[PDB]
């Protein structure tokens with residue numbers, strides 16, 4: 425397959441549903457390369473667990489942890505890492521209030537080349553155990569011969585865009601990794617990078633990040649088809665921010681408008697949002713504890729009940745993962761009968777203004793609070809007009825895209841409610857016999 429899009433292994437499903445999946449131990453194995461150095465960008469870290477995921481022969485190679493923690497949280501992380509002299513830490517600046525470092529990425533420098541892994545999992549045991557998570561694996565990028573002058577650039581501009589993303593941190597440990605990337609040939613990359621970094625962007629910078637970055641890529645590298653207004657937008661996420669008092673404030677004004685862009689010329693497009701119901705969580709492999717990783721607070725939800733009429737259940741029979749709660753985030757543009765898609769994005773970005781950006785200053789400035797990172801699959805980058813949806817995720821033409829959940833999405837029933845993590849659920853017990861008492 426050309427897409428190199430994987431799910432994480434789920435403990436408890438039948439082997440046929442883990443055949444093409446990846447555990448973190450697989451990603452870090454010597455079969456993927458002989459490790460020299462690695463950088464782990466993430467939100468949450470269990471350092472003791474993380475080091476055990478590297479092969480024993482590689483556990484003393486340098487590791488850089490890129491994080492957003494401050495004050496006591498930062499001290500706790502440093503305390504976690506001090507037993508390991510090979511671990512350095514880089515604190516990503518978060519100068520806008522309520523931002524987080526939410527990017528999940530591995531930079532893996534080998535004796536044989538370089539690999540980039542952009543994924544959705546925190547570096548803790550539970551995120552790789554029984555959750556639905558996504559992984560994009562880059563090709564093995566060879567080193568450019570010393571003395572040779574070539575760009576090493578892809579038709580999707582991935583090398584320059586990844587360097588641009590890392591430059592935004594303004595961090596000396598990441599300048600080292602920028603120099604490493606400069607020395608490698610990334611020309612085989614067929615995905616577009618979509619990043620978010622904190623800031624207020626206007627003018628030439630407005631299209632660099634967040635949902636304006638997505639809009640720019642869809643304008644430049646997708647084509648609008650007849651009946652485009654009938655191709656829905658699907659968003660699928662594990663957290664929801666405060667979106668405003670009605671859909672006109674952000675969701676259906678600037679976010680949806682970016683998502684429905686196709687081609688270069690100048691809305692009744694259906695919008696499907698997939699987010700676990702209480703019942704999805706209760707009957708999940710983890711039970712109610714799965715909702716500890718679906719952080720939608722009652723305070724936020726009570727101010728936007730209008731939003732929940734967009735919500736659809738999690739269902740993933742296609743990948744055997746209906747009971748493996750999603751921590752992957754995905755966005756895509758299917759055809760009206762869900763048999764094709766115009767594009768697919770896997771990312772760390774949840775459904776929030778912090779992650780995607782919100783327009784400010786009379787529409788001239790895009791303000792982003794957080795770091796986020798994802799990769800965009802466009803048919804044009806594969807010589808295609810659209811992708812055909814693979815009918816079974818782990819089944820066999822290779823030009824069909826493996827969508828990891830069921831289509832069409834199923835609307836919440838009248839008795840369903842969105843998972844809200846800080847209220848109790850004491851009416852029916854979960855798969856482990858327990859209630860939920862926050």
Ligand SMILES: O=C(O)c1ccc(Nc2c(-c3ccccc3)nc3ccccn23)cc1C(=O)O
Nearest residue numbers: 467468522524526546662663716717718719774
């Ligand atoms: O992707 C996701 O679902 C996700 C969502 C939120 C998040 N950070 C976070 C948490 C928190 C704290 C402890 C345990 C779980 C979440 N609380 C707040 C409050 C405000 C802003 C961010 N917050 C991290 C992730 C991730 O998994 O990276």
